[PDB]
Amino acid sequence: EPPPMESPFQREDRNSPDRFDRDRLFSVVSRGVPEELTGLLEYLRWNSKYLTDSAYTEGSTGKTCLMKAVLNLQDGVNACIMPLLQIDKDSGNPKLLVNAQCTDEFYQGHSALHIAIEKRSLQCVKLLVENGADVHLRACGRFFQKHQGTCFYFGELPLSLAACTKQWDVVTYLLENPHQPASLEATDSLGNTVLHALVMIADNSPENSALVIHMYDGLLQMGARLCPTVQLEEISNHQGLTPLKLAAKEGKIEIFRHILQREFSGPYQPLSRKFTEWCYGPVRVSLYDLSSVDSWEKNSVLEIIAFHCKSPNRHRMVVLEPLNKLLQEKWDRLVSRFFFNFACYLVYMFIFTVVAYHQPSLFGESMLLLGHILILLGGIYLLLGQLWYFWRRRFMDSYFEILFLLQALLTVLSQVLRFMETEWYLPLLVLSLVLGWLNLLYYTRGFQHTGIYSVMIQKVILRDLLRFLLVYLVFLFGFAVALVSLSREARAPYRSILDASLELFKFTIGMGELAFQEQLRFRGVVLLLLLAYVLLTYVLLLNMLIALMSETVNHVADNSWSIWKLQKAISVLEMENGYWWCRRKKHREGRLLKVGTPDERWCFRVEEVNWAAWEKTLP
Amino acid sequence: EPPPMESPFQREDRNSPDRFDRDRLFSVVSRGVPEELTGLLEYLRWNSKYLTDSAYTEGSTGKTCLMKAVLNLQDGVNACIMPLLQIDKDSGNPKLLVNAQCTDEFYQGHSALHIAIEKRSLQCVKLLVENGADVHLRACGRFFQKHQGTCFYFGELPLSLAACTKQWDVVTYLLENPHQPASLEATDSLGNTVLHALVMIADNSPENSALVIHMYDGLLQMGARLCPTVQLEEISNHQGLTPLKLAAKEGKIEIFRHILQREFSGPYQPLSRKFTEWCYGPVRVSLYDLSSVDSWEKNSVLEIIAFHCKSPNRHRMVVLEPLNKLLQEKWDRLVSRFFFNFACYLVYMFIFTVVAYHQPSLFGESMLLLGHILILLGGIYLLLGQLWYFWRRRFMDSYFEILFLLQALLTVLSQVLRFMETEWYLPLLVLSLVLGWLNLLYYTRGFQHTGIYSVMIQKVILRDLLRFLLVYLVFLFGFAVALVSLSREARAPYRSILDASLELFKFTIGMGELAFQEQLRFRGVVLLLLLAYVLLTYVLLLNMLIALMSETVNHVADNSWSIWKLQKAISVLEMENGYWWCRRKKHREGRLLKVGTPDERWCFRVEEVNWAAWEKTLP
Numbered sequence A, B: 001e002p003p004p005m006e007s008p009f010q011r012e013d014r015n016s017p018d019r020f021d022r023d024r025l026f027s028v029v030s031r032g033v034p035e036e037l038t039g040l041l042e043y044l045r046w047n048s049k050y051l052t053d054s055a056y057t058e059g060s061t062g063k064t065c066l067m068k069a070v071l072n073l074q075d076g077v078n079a080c081i082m083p084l085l086q087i088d089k090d091s092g093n094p095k096l097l098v099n100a101q102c103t104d105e106f107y108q109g110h111s112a113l114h115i116a117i118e119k120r121s122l123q124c125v126k127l128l129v130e131n132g133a134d135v136h137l138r139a140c141g142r143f144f145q146k147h148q149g150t151c152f153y154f155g156e157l158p159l160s161l162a163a164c165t166k167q168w169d170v171v172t173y174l175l176e177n178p179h180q181p182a183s184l185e186a187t188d189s190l191g192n193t194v195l196h197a198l199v200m201i202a203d204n205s206p207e208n209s210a211l212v213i214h215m216y217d218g219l220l221q222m223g224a225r226l227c228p229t230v231q232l233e234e235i236s237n238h239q240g241l242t243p244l245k246l247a248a249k250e251g252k253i254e255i256f257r258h259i260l261q262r263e264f265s266g267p268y269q270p271l272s273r274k275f276t277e278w279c280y281g282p283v284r285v286s287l288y289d290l291s292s293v294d295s296w297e298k299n300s301v302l303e304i305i306a307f308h309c310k311s312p313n314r315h316r317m318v319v320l321e322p323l324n325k326l327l328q329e330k331w332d333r334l335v336s337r338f339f340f341n342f343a344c345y346l347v348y349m350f351i352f353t354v355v356a357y358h359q360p361s362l363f364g365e366s367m368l369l370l371g372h373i374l375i376l377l378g379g380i381y382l383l384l385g386q387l388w389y390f391w392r393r394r395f396m397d398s399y400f401e402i403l404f405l406l407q408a409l410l411t412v413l414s415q416v417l418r419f420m421e422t423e424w425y426l427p428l429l430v431l432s433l434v435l436g437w438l439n440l441l442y443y444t445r446g447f448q449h450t451g452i453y454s455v456m457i458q459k460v461i462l463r464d465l466l467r468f469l470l471v472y473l474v475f476l477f478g479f480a481v482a483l484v485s486l487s488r489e490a491r492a493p494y495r496s497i498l499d500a501s502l503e504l505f506k507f508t509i510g511m512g513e514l515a516f517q518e519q520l521r522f523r524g525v526v527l528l529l530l531l532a533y534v535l536l537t538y539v540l541l542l543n544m545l546i547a548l549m550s551e552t553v554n555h556v557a558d559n560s561w562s563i564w565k566l567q568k569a570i571s572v573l574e575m576e577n578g579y580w581w582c583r584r585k586k587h588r589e590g591r592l593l594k595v596g597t598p599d600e601r602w603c604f605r606v607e608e609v610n611w612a613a614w615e616k617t618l619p
């Protein structure tokens, strides 16, 4: 268990002229008086130690006397910090105590400047900075990393901590002091910068969103005038993302939306992304920026939303522009490939159904052999394509992206059984055929009127059905074992465990026997136990029905269009790569315009019409 | 792709003493200074060109320099417009540049006056009008026409555009200027007048409704004093409608309600429609106006609501008065025809059932032959009536209006089979019989206690059932093909595709086999595939049930009375024409009263009692 960093009740632990112990030092510093600090210098120069040694620190963490001074800050000002740092300078230690930090696993690197910044005191921050404290000390402990349980994640920097805490004066003093200037370009471990730490502390609540949007714009505006020669929104962390991509991956929708369509009028225009070129009543035409939003480059916002994301908000980022217009422009160009692919799959499935039906038992024979050869070639091509897709991609939207493989694999496996002349090529093949018709359902995603209907009608969750089936199946097996064990002595029904399981399952499709057998010694108890099974199956079925109804009473129904748009987006980004043998050359979208200053950016126009805002701007 | 009409970033395109190119002209006009316009006149008189030629315009659209001047309007005033028009006048061109307009397809006819009116600047409008610009220039491009996608529909006139934008000062200046007076009577393409364009931009939202009601009343009041000799609410567009009928057709309920019962006290009384004659406590008697609201004339509000309308708000216009009282007065007079028609149909159906039941296999014989003759005559009369109804009418309310035809057609077709002595007159006839009993259900619309019950009990949508049946039927056919293909090799059930389809459908009515067949080589896989079919049919049925319940949970239930009133209104307006052989003379309803001034109007009194408003007017 990690010790607390300061505690008024639990004392510190030493576990790793006059005598002046560390306990008296902590006692006089915690109260906060400088008169009783006399005699420290003479004692240190007699014992030939330094104030940052192992004697004067909590050995379990590494907390020095200065951090106890700052942690006992009363009314924002401590009168002991200045003489303590002065006598530390007079001691002549090589390692300065102002920038000392802990060495424990929990609070590694946690300096005094972080404590002074968190205590919302500009005076202690000024006293620490003016006495030679570096402003790039990283807090690398487990307590300052994003994980479940007890943690407070910030960007492991004094400036990041000042940014996450909404205090503006401390951010300004760190950014433009003469004694020790910080930098917005400085990075911690995991590669994050201060524009990343704001994104990773965002939330979908409106207050936290307003906080992080305001402070993100503020830091970007100060980065415009402090270090204009560097693009602050293009520095990459160790995963390879940028702040826009990191907003896309984590599921933070609000700061992602604000970053995607921010606009500042005036001198701060060159760092905008949404430029409006004309507007006529309700219609407004805006030139959005496709820098790392299109799929022509490497991992971008579209692919990160499509594949590398696990969040319930991955279906609402697609709807907001300029992702909606971009994916609509991609779909209106690549719908022909989808329809031709669907027609080829339908022709392959028709020839499969013909071969499976008109088949001899164990010109027409030559036609059927050509059909078998064509089925084998189609199955091996589909198998190669699906194995390519999995190997490149190294969850319900991927559901139909695995069954294809089964409809491939079984098929080719069935055909090698046909080449082995066994008596099992007929089940697996026709089993494949059943799966194949189910596998056609994915191709409803390409048409509007049936795609919206499919997304609207999928009103049950798969995990609920697969849990209920498992519970009912264990129930059936247990009662089947009991019924076989009960009916062994004659005065025959329920002879084996499988037959008794079938005759028990027959009560769910609606045809059960339920009578005196007149062949069993214990036929009354058999009837009683069957009555118990019926009365329990009805409770289980009613519970499942009630649970599904309670699930479907209270949810919003507007997500149908968003989910359909996401499914179409995944299919578009899949087809944009091309086939595994005819790799499609990626076509850059947008036009290279000149906005501001020679600032040449890729731009993409969208024409949005909205009568409500136009009615609002009217008198 | 159409080019933008102005764009600060994308430059214009030429695609269709000192030199003074069009690029320098656009550069100096866009900034907005007049000092650098010097030397233009000498250059134009040396090169013998004009300022509106092809050289000085964006050839892709036809945009002139003046429209670039107005589109770069800063703080409402440009100092360049006045010298530009002055030097255009000094150039001596035959075609004036002030009223020049585009010639592209997308922005056809879009003048500078439209831009100045949209920019909400009275000063630029005054400068354009005073320098000789006609006020009847029509914007005929696709961008200014009502269609899906990107469009801004107004009445293609400067006055209509000033009317749709809620600005009052520009409307007044266009209406009463001495330099170039506009007119409320002027019409664009599609025949619309200014009062029509207000209706076609209306909406059911309260803010837009309040805007359009206020501005409609305002323009009507100004039309009272500018051009009193013309009725502004009687001009017909090219479809033949008036503003009231256009409000009825499009589904705009709020402006339709306001137009139907507007009243102004004082000097503006003669243009009202609802006159109150007396009011005593709560009861109030009002003389509404039946000008184009009754069905005695040509296409009126009642017929346009009844037939020529496709909107979800066609069942709420009937409930609001004076349509409610009018249709109640029609129904209380024409209920006898409905009941006599129902009794005649019931007698015809009883004789049909008797003939279908007491029929010999392949005095009583003469009676049955007379019954057959009467069935043939009734069927041919009903067929002639229904063919008349379709040919004159050249959707669920029309559903029962087609099945009659089938109950006609099959019947007469069955009888000609009886005259052909074939072995198929017995199925079709009795099939007709079944349909006819279903065809009786439409006649529940005439009685209150069962009509409200029928409208209340119709709680399912037909398209959902017809989609679910299609999905389940494809499912059944696919599994039937698989089951026939699997069971071919003996060690018999499931022999043909139709029999296997029937034995698979038997799991839905609640009687399935589900056992080891002991006759098939692959009987275990047959059992497994039947289990798969059962487990999938239950998922599909549960999904359909959940979807219907979710559609049922969250909806308003007050629409039963409105839908029943609409159905009764459709039946009344159908019977008012009369039979196809005894065309009923149309009877004018209301009385010819004299209200205001000799203003003789058809009027219809309604007695409305409402305790709530009377409680509000009390202290």
Ligand SMILES: C=C(C)[C@@H]1CCC(C)=C[C@H]1c1c(O)cc(CCCCC)cc1O
Residues within 6 Å of the ligand: A532, A534, A535, A536, A538, A539, A542
């Ligand atoms: C309302 C339910 C869920 C069913 C509806 C069908 C009928 C006949 C019985 C009801 C029922 C009970 O009312 C109570 C139990 C629990 C007692 C089990 C004793 C072994 C089971 C049980 O199926």
Ligand SMILES: C=C(C)[C@@H]1CCC(C)=C[C@H]1c1c(O)cc(CCCCC)cc1O
Residues within 6 Å of the ligand: A464, A465, A466, A467, A468, A469, A470, A472, A508, A544, B532, B534, B535, B536, B538, B539, B542
């Ligand atoms: C709760 C439902 C919808 C039914 C209720 C009746 C019973 C016995 C089974 C349930 C059920 C599953 O719980 C899961 C599936 C999907 C797995 C199919 C495997 C081929 C189907 C499936 O009918």
Ligand SMILES: NCCOB(c1ccccc1)c1ccccc1
Residues within 6 Å of the ligand: B449, B450, B453
């Ligand atoms: N009064 C004789 C039956 O009328 B029905 C009826 C009677 C009173 C109130 C409402 C309806 C009726 C019964 C079943 C279906 C439809 C109508």
Ligand SMILES: NCCOB(c1ccccc1)c1ccccc1
Residues within 6 Å of the ligand: A449, A450, A453, B466, B467, B468, B470, B471
């Ligand atoms: N148009 C032919 C059938 O299309 B379907 C359809 C038609 C119109 C609107 C919506 C869907 C369809 C029917 C059942 C299931 C899925 C789709």
